[PDB]
Amino acid sequence: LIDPRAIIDPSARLAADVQVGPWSIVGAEVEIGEGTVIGPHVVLKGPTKIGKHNRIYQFSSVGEDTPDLKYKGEPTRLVIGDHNVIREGVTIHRGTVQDRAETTIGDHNLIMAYAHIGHDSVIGNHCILVNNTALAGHVHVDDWAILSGYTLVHQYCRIGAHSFSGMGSAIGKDVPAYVTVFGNPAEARSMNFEGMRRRGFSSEAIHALRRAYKVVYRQGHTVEEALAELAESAAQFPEVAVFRDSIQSATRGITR
Amino acid sequence: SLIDPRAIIDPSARLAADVQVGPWSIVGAEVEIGEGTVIGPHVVLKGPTKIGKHNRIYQFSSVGEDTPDLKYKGEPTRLVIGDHNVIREGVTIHRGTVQDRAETTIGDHNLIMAYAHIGHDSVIGNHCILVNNTALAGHVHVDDWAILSGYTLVHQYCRIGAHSFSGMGSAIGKDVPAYVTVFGNPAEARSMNFEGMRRRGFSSEAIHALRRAYKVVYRQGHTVEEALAELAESAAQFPEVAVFRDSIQSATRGITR
Amino acid sequence: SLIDPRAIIDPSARLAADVQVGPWSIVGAEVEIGEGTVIGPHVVLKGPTKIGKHNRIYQFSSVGEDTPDLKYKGEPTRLVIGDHNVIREGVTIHRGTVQDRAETTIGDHNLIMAYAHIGHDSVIGNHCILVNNTALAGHVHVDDWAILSGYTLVHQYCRIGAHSFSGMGSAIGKDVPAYVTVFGNPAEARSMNFEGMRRRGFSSEAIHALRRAYKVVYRQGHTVEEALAELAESAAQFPEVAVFRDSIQSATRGITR
Ligand SMILES: CC(C)(C)OC(=O)N[C@@H](Cc1c[nH]c2ccccc12)C(=O)Nc1nnn[nH]1
Ligand SMILES: CC(C)(C)OC(=O)N[C@H](Cc1c[nH]c2ccccc12)C(=O)Nc1nnn[nH]1
Numbered sequence: 133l134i135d136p137r138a139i140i141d142p143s144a145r146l147a148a149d150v151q152v153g154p155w156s157i158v159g160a161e162v163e164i165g166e167g168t169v170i171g172p173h174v175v176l177k178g179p180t181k182i183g184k185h186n187r188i189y190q191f192s193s194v195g196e197d198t199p200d201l202k203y204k205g206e207p208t209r210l211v212i213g214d215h216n217v218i219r220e221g222v223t224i225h226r227g228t229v230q231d232r233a234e235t236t237i238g239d240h241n242l243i244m245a246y247a248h249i250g251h252d253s254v255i256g257n258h259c260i261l262v263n264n265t266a267l268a269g270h271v272h273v274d275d276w277a278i279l280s281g282y283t284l285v286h287q288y289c290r291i292g293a294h295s296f297s298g299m300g301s302a303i304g305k306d307v308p309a310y311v312t313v314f315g316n317p318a319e320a321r322s323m324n325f326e327g328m329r330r331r332g333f334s335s336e337a338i339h340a341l342r343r344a345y346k347v348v349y350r351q352g353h354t355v356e357e358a359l360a361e362l363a364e365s366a367a368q369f370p371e372v373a374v375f376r377d378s379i380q381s382a383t384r385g386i387t388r
Numbered sequence: 389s390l391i392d393p394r395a396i397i398d399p400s401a402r403l404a405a406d407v408q409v410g411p412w413s414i415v416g417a418e419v420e421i422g423e424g425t426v427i428g429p430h431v432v433l434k435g436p437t438k439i440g441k442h443n444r445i446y447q448f449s450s451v452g453e454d455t456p457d458l459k460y461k462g463e464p465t466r467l468v469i470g471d472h473n474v475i476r477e478g479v480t481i482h483r484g485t486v487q488d489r490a491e492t493t494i495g496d497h498n499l500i501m502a503y504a505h506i507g508h509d510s511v512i513g514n515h516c517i518l519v520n521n522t523a524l525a526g527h528v529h530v531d532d533w534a535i536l537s538g539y540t541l542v543h544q545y546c547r548i549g550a551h552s553f554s555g556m557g558s559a560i561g562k563d564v565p566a567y568v569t570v571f572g573n574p575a576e577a578r579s580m581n582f583e584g585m586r587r588r589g590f591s592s593e594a595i596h597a598l599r600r601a602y603k604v605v606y607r608q609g610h611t612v613e614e615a616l617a618e619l620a621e622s623a624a625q626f627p628e629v630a631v632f633r634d635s636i637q638s639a640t641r642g643i644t645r
Numbered sequence: 646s647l648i649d650p651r652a653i654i655d656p657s658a659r660l661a662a663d664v665q666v667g668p669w670s671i672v673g674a675e676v677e678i679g680e681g682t683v684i685g686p687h688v689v690l691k692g693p694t695k696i697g698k699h700n701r702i703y704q705f706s707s708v709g710e711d712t713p714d715l716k717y718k719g720e721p722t723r724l725v726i727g728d729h730n731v732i733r734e735g736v737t738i739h740r741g742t743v744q745d746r747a748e749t750t751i752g753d754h755n756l757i758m759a760y761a762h763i764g765h766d767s768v769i770g771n772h773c774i775l776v777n778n779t780a781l782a783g784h785v786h787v788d789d790w791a792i793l794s795g796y797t798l799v800h801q802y803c804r805i806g807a808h809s810f811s812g813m814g815s816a817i818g819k820d821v822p823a824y825v826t827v828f829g830n831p832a833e834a835r836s837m838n839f840e841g842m843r844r845r846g847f848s849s850e851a852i853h854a855l856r857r858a859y860k861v862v863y864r865q866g867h868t869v870e871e872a873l874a875e876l877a878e879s880a881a882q883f884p885e886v887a888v889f890r891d892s893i894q895s896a897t898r899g900i901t902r
């Protein structure tokens with residue numbers, strides 16, 4: 133199971149069932165949960181927790197220090213939940229003390245080749261980061277979001293649930309939930325209707341969201357004006373509450 | 389010896405005469421490597437995969453992996469690489485899918501530069517150049533002598549025409565006709581790869597006919613059907629113009645404008 | 646032992662006494678590493694290459710490979726890296742070509758982040774930051790304190806001026822004068838790196854002269870020659886404005902407007 137050409141540190145803690153391929157390093161204070169397959173040529177540094185039925189592909193560096201000059205050797209964490217797929221050459225950095233000292237990844241995420249998850253970034257669940265997506269630092273990606281290949285996300289930006297970025301997008305402002313964004317700089321186009329139909333959203337929920345988009349984007353309203361209009365549609369439909377909450381929590385403005 | 393003893397060579401792998409495998413490389417089950425092919429160190433080959441003769445594959449490359457685009461994979465899907473190809477550091481090439489071609493296909497004399505991605509069921513021809521971090525989604529066809537500048541992104545099902553050129557950071561969402569130069573995200577047609585025509589020894593008459601051929605398609609408000617009819621005569625006279633017309637004829641999903 | 650036994654040290658390699666090399670790293674023929682330098686695991690160092698003192702080179706990096714550039718034909722060319730440089734994961738640095746100066750040169754105190762590329766015959770000075778996946782094509786000069794944000798692409802022969810800044814995903818096809826801030830694909834001149842100047846402690850008087858110097862080049866309908874002639878006075882008075890004027894004077898591909 134543990135290939136004899138792998139270096140497993142004494143401090144490491146590997147649940148039974150765990151596979152580690154040859155020439156992989158499981159470093160000091162790295163936990164791995166049952167069912168997790170670590171590939172060949174993987175560098176795991178801690179303090180790091182990895183959950184269950186994860187797959188980490190060759191040439192990935194999971195749990196290294198941020199090179200960001202605002203990090204001076206403090207003991208910070210990286211947590212990864214269950215049923216994640218981390219592909220070839222992904223880099224995931226641990227937190228910094230300045231924020232919450234944790235980089236966090238939930239469950240059922242698909243992180244494609246050469247993606248970068250910067251320090252203190254929070255990834256939720258069932259997210260897809262397509263090839264070479266780069267999250268700068270303190271980036272929050274809520275559940276089911278999809279970032280197309282070579283999507284760049286500025287420090288501290290929030291990526292809403294069910295949001296979609298087009299290929300080569302450069303995001304400098306929050307993307308509300310359900311919103312599709314394209315280009316450099318990134319601009320709002322539409323709602324992720326396919327994402328809603330994926331979730332078996334009621335036809336009434338999809339209509340409430342279709343309208344909610346117009347309130348925010350295509351009706352000349354300010355953000356405070358728009359939050360007021362959405363407050364009843366949000367009280368009625370939980371799906372709209374997600375959209376409304378993503379705009380409310382966007383203190384640094386929304387992607388328009 | 390040619391096979392470094394720190395490399396893992398599966399019993400089912402077939403190595404031909406003059407093959408080199410550098411240290412800590414994996415030659416997985418049902419990988420076939422042809423005559424004089426050099427596998428660097430830290431290379432992962434996964435099968436079923438057929439690599440031809442006098443190829444060079446650099447460190448940190450993953451050649452023959454499964455697409456992550458499916459969660460439950462198919463077997464057997466194949467990867468076929470021809471002769472005299474250069475695959476540089478950190479390149480990812482995915483095998484085909486059971487739904488579509490069941491094969492990713494690369495021809496001969498191609499240069500695939502560092503960290504380029506070739507997605508499931510894509511077809512590369514001959515004498516192509518994929519510059520650093522070019523990424524092909526899935527079922528992309530790159531025809532002979534196409535050059536994609538670094539960080540070019542190509543959407544699923546798109547055709548890259550022969551002798552075409554993409555500018556750095558191009559995001560191609562529709563077919564690029566033969567010879568056409570495209571730039572930006574989203575990609576826009578600018579001109580033709582006259583530089584590339586001269587290097588292939590194209591007659592100046594064939595180049596003048598291709599310049600007029602660009603105007604017919606792009607600059608004179610014609611339907612594609614009208615463009616094809618208007619090009620028919622030039623196309624009969626010059627094989628070079630026929631390559632252009634044929635690339636436009638085969639675009640079901642529209643051309644890059 | 647500071648040399649991991651699983652590492653490959655070519656007999657012809659010249660390592661200072663306290664050099665570290667992690668497991669499964671290759672220090673090839675005619676590679677020299679100065680005192681304090683830590684090489685991580687899974688690094689390929691190829692020569693002829695000189696690395697100075699107190700450098701750090703992370704896993705999956707390929708430092709000193711031949712350029713795939715077709716004009717190179719296996720000639721004996723060099724890479725030279727100075728002291729106190731950080732080279733992050735999967736960085737690729739190519740040696741030079743005989744057509745230029747047969748050398749790729751990196752100075753001191755540079756931070757080169759994950760999957761950056763430094764093409765043949767590139768010259769990087771001191772205190773530069775190349776953020777993730779920055780790609781320099783070839784013969785690119787990046788002068789002191791320049792910051793290039795992630796996925797910045799730089800065309801062959803482009804000069805990146807001192808204390809210059811490029812935004813996320815910039816595509817630089819023309820020279821970036823010193824202090825100038827550029828964004829987007831293609832790169833556009835926005836203003837000057839005042840944030841960067843103020844922080845490094847530039848004089849109020851100097852910043853004010855650079856602001857007017859910016860106006861002169863960009864905002865007064867002057868051609869480059871008329872701009873340089875107008876700059877003559879302030880260039881004469883202020884060094885910072887001389888660096889600016891000089892970076893314009895040495896621009897071979899034009900300047901980013
Ligand atoms: C550049 C590259 C890497 C070759 O392709 C992509 O970036 N992504 C595709 C879509 C895609 C791939 N896997 C997925 C899984 C779930 C949902 C969508 C996808 C795409 O083409 N995105 C897009 N379309 N228009 N603009 N950007
Ligand atoms: C692609 C990726 C990694 C997700 O994002 C970045 O490139 N981040 C940079 C951060 C940065 C700014 N200055 C620095 C100095 C040293 C080190 C890092 C920086 C940025 O966000 N660049 C920018 N700013 N405005 N537009 N693009």
Ligand SMILES: CC(C)(C)OC(=O)N[C@H](Cc1c[nH]c2ccccc12)C(=O)Nc1nnn[nH]1
Pocket residue numbers: 517519520535537538539554555556780781782798799800801818
């Ligand atoms: C992103 C990176 C790696 C830093 O540079 C490039 O993409 N380089 C290409 C090189 C090139 C130009 N002409 C060629 C012919 C044959 C073969 C390679 C080329 C380019 O620069 N492409 C372009 N030019 N203008 N916009 N994009």
